[PDB]
Structures are given as structure tokens and as C-alpha cells.
Paper text:
Kirsten rat sarcoma viral oncogene homologue ([name]), a key component of the pathway, is the most commonly mutated oncogene and is a key driver of tumor growth in several human cancers. [name] cycles between an inactive guanosine diphosphate (GDP)-loaded and active guanosine triphosphate (GTP)-loaded state, acting as a molecular switch for downstream signal transduction. Proteolysis targeting chimeras (PROTACs) are heterobifunctional modalities, which recruit an E3 ligase to a protein of interest, resulting in subsequent ubiquitination and degradation of the target protein via the ubiquitin-proteasome system. Here, we address this gap through the development of heterobifunctional [name]-based PROTACs capable of engaging and degrading [name]­(on), thus addressing a wider range of [name] mutations.
We recently disclosed our efforts toward identifying an in vivo active [name]-based [name] degrader, with 1 and ACBI3 identified as potent degraders of multiple [name]­(off) alleles. However, neither was found to effectively degrade [name], Q61K, Q61L, and Q61R. We obtained suitable cocrystal ternary complex structures of 1 with KRASG12R([name])-VCB and 3 with both KRASG12V(GDP)-VCB and KRASG12R([name])-VCB at resolutions of 2.83, 2.63, and 2.89 Å, respectively. However, there were no significant differences observed at the [name]–[name] binding interface to explain the observed difference in the ternary kinetic stability between the two compounds. As expected, differences in the Switch II loop are observed between the G12V­(GDP) and [name]­([name]) variants for each compound.
Residue numbers in the entry:
A (entry chain B): 17 to 50, 57 to 112
B (entry chain C): 60 to 207
C (entry chain A): 1 to 104
D (entry chain D): 1 to 29, 39 to 168
Write the structure that this text describes.
Amino acid sequence: MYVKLISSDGHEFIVKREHALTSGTIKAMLSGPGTNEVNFREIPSHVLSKVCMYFTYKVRYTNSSTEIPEFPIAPEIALELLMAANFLDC
Amino acid sequence: RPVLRSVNSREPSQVIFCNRSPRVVLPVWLNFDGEPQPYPTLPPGTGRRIHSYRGHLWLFRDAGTHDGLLVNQTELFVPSLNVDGQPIFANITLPVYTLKERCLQVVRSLVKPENYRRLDIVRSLYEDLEDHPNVQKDLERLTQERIA
Amino acid sequence: MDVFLMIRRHKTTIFTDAKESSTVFELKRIVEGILKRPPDEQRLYKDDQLLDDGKTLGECGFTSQTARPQAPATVGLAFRADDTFEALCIEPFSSPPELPDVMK
Amino acid sequence: MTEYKLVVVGARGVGKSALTIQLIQNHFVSYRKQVVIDGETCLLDILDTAGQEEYSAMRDQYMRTGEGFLCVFAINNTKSFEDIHHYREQIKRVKDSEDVPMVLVGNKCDLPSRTVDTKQAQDLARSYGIPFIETSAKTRQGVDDAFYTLVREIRKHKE
Ligand SMILES: Cc1ncsc1-c1ccc(CNC(=O)[C@@H]2C[C@@H](O)CN2C(=O)[C@@H](c2cc(OCCCCN3CCCN(c4nccc(-c5noc([C@@]6(C)CCCc7sc(N)c(C#N)c76)n5)n4)[C@@H](C)C3)no2)C(C)C)cc1
Ligand SMILES: Nc1nc2c(ncn2[C@@H]2O[C@H](COP(=O)(O)OP(=O)(O)CP(=O)(O)O)[C@@H](O)[C@H]2O)c(=O)[nH]1
Ligand SMILES: [Mg+2]
């Protein structure tokens, strides 16, 4: 089962639902105590893509036992991704 | 006596410190008083046959930024006793950092602490940038987490 | 060994994974389970070259060293409306602003 | 004139003091001596010959000032050779580096009760990447070579 994450400029991101829930914010907008897509009005596509890459990164290398690589963040995207990560609680 | 402290077992145990992180790793030994004591740095990809003792507590941080690291996928490492003299292996790895904390690291390395307040970010992120990783802070957390 | 991919068509991007030993047809099967389009109507591309449905992902160049989860490899996607085949077009992502002087 | 601060280390009774006394006064029963080693006149200063065990922050700060180390064991005593590892590792700890000028020294080669074969020590020294010299504090044999070699290994470590 998958979920669509829409950026500010209309870029659509189909990512595994379990991967999107790694962020407390997305987890709260879909699974409350009681919903197939969510629109992010202030996150450009070049940031939401990196966030999805973090999702699959978080999901895969959590259960890893031998060695984990660094998650690279380019300097030009650093601030825009920091705002998003703080906003998304991931 | 604190809980996060080494034990005076006086029983040596040969250990292999393995830096499988892209960081220069600072091995930190918690002495018998719980005081973090620094040990020689490990370049990325380095392995050293180390001489420790049974019951001695260790943790590992980035030598430059003091970022938290994992050793055998746990925050702390205690060597058992060598069975038939074979060494115990310590596998220092990167954590799966939060995307926020990893972002903090990247900007801390790019901006000097004086220029933190010269960015278009929210004010809450200013104090989050200034809250640099500190070993004493983590030890207080890991002590309170041992309330089992 | 797994490989992590970004299947992209127009402004849509799919984050999925598969094994190096898996073939392109099996990837087309996963795209059918998401976008509800038959694999016969699917055409997967590495950059600009068409991928053979019988060749495994590793055989196309998607090794674990090139399709990492923190840096996936990009696969193009083009559909076929009946006997009419569309042109592969992947609308690029947005651009980041120039890095502030405080970081140079 | 450059000065080289040397520390003699080893198990109890291996002959650390005897070696240094043999080095300075050429006699067998403050440690400074001017000497010419490889055309450069220097001053050797032996920092410690006492084998007692003391992990005080003051002794650490004292050993940290030493530039070279003579790791000494007696070939008449097997455990003195086995403990060499521990002394070597403690040197790495105080110096905060994996590569520190060091020389493995086997003392009491005049005694006829050898229990540690010479082949063992050269193999241990070859694994440590440091020179190995057999010495005798009673017969002056190798004493000069052992200290001068350490001075040579100190000059080699300064790139
Ligand atoms: C390279 C590298 N890269 C990344 S990490 C790394 C690395 C580098 C070095 C090491 C070394 N390992 C450690 O630091 C381990 C790790 C952790 O577990 C705590 N720890 C410890 O050693 C701690 C410890 C000891 C312990 O029980 C101790 C039980 C030992 C029992 N004894 C009794 C038998 C004889 N005998 C002995 N008899 C007399 C004298 C000596 C001696 N020995 O040296 C030195 C000299 C004079 C010579 C060298 C320079 C310095 S300086 C300093 N103060 C010195 C002194 N007195 C020295 N004389 N020995 C030993 C073989 C065994 N319980 O905790 C110490 C620090 C209090 C570990 C890792
Ligand atoms: N036959 C012989 N005896 C030696 C030799 N070197 C040292 N000794 C003897 O070993 C004993 C201990 O050596 P000494 O230098 O006095 O002590 P040390 O190793 O400094 C002892 P500590 O570690 O307690 O300071 C002495 O009785 C000394 O005569 C040697 O080359 N030959
Ligand atoms: Mg003495």
C-alpha cells in the first residue's frame, strides 16, 4: 500500500505508506486515533524528494546491523530540508 | 557511585575497535567514577586491537562534532571476557539520525556558530543549532533510561 | 542485494525497491499495482535507453552501488494509449535558491 | 642542541635502572648525558626507570612529556615479555597516538637461563614495527645501541 505526497509545485510522490509514517507529522495526518494523499503547500519538489529519499533511507538502514552510510545533504538544499525536517518531525 | 561507570574487574579483555563510519571516531571510556575519558582517535575505516577490561563501559562520538554513534548497534559497549582468548569485536557505526538532526549537523559544519543567527530559518531552529552534541548531556539521558 | 529506484513520468515520481536479480517485467508488474496500467502498456527507461523486459535490474546498470536508498537511480516511464506510444518526458524538479553568503 | 626525553619501561626487575646506570656512568651494581648520534649532538634525558604501577593523572602528564620509550623485558622471565603489550598500550594512551617512538629491549642476555627465545621477540617487534635490541646491563653489551636506536626512532617520527 502506497501514499501520494504532493509538493508545492505539483510534483507527485508515490511512496510506501510505511515509509511515509517515519515522520510524526505525516503519521498524524493519516492515522489519528480514528486519507490517501496529502498536499504540502510550502515544500518544493526538490526538497520533498530528498525527504522521501530519507524515508527509504530510514526504513532500510534501521534494521541494518553491520554498517550504515551517511545521509548526504547538499549545502544548497540544507536550509530548505532543515525547515522541512523540523516541520515534518522526522 | 553512578550507574554509568566501569567496574574494577582488573580482568583484561582484548577488543577490536572498528570504525565503520565515515567520521573520525573518538572512543570515550567511562572510568570508575563515570567521568568520560578520551582515547586516541580512529580514522574512518580503521581497526585497532585494543586492550580493555571486563565490565568497562565505552561509547563513541565523532571526534570533531561529538555526534552520537553506535557500537554493535547499541549506544554503549561492554566487552565480555574472552572465551579461549579470542578478541571481542566492537563495530562502531553511524546512527540512523533524524532528518532534522542530520540537517543540524550539516549546517553546523558549514556555518560558524557566530553566524547561526544570520539565516532565514525560524527562531526555534537557532537554539536547536546551538544545542551542540554533548557527552555529559547524553550520559544523563542514558542513566535515566536505565530506570529498569 | 536490493536496489532503490525513482520511477518518473511527467511530474509523478514513485519510490519503490527491488532486487538486483529481478527483471524489468517484474518492475513493470509493481508499476501496474500502483498506477493501474498494464505492463504491456509500460516502457521503462534508464536515462534514454529502453530496458529489456527479460534483463535483470543489475544487468541494466542498477547495482547496489548506483541505486542506493539515500541516492536512488532514476527510471523513466512512458505509456501506450492503445497503439499510440507517448514520448518519454520527465518534468524536472524545482531548483534551490543560491546558497546564502553565511555558508560560503 | 636538541634534547631527547626517553622513558625506560618494563616489568619489575627487568633491569631498567641497571641499563640506564650502565648507559651513563658505564657502571653495573638525575639521568642526563651529552652524546653524538648520527652527526647531530644531542642530550639524552632518562625520565623514569621505576616500574611501580601508578595511574595517576600526574604520572600520565609526566609520561606524556616523554618522547621515546624503551620497552624492556628480562629473557630470564617469561611474564616480563608477555606484559610488554600492556606497557606499549599505556604509552599509546598517554601519547594519544597509535605511532609513538618505541624500541623493544631484551635484557639479561648474559644469563644462561633464557626462557624467551630471540626469535619470539623479533617476531613481536616485527608486528609492532619497532626495532628490537638484546642488551646486557652487566656487560655493556647493546646498551648504547638500544638508546641511540630509540633516538633514531624519535628523529624518524618527526617526518
Ligand atoms: C590505540 C587506541 N586507539 C583507539 S583507543 C586506543 C587505546 C590505547 C591504549 C589503551 C590502553 N588501555 C586502557 O587504557 C584501558 C581501557 C579501559 O579499559 C581503561 N584502561 C586502562 O588501562 C585503565 C585500567 C587499568 C585497569 O586495571 C589495571 C590492572 C593492571 C595490573 N597490572 C599488574 C601486573 C603488572 N603490570 C604493571 N605493573 C607495573 C607497572 C605497569 C605499567 N603499565 O604501564 C606503565 C607505564 C610506566 C609505562 C607506559 C606509560 C605509563 S602511563 C602510566 N600511568 C603508567 C603506569 N603505571 C605507565 N607501567 N604495569 C600490568 C601488566 C598489569 N583497569 O582500568 C587505566 C587507564 C587506569 C586502550 C586503547
Ligand atoms: N646478570 C644480570 N643482572 C642484571 C642485568 N640487568 C639487570 N640485572 C639485575 O636485575 C635486578 C633488577 O635490575 P634493576 O635495574 O636494579 O631494577 P629495575 O628493573 O629498575 C626494578 P623496578 O622495576 O622495581 O624499578 C638487579 O639485581 C640487577 O643487578 C643484566 O644484564 N645481567
Ligand atoms: Mg627503578
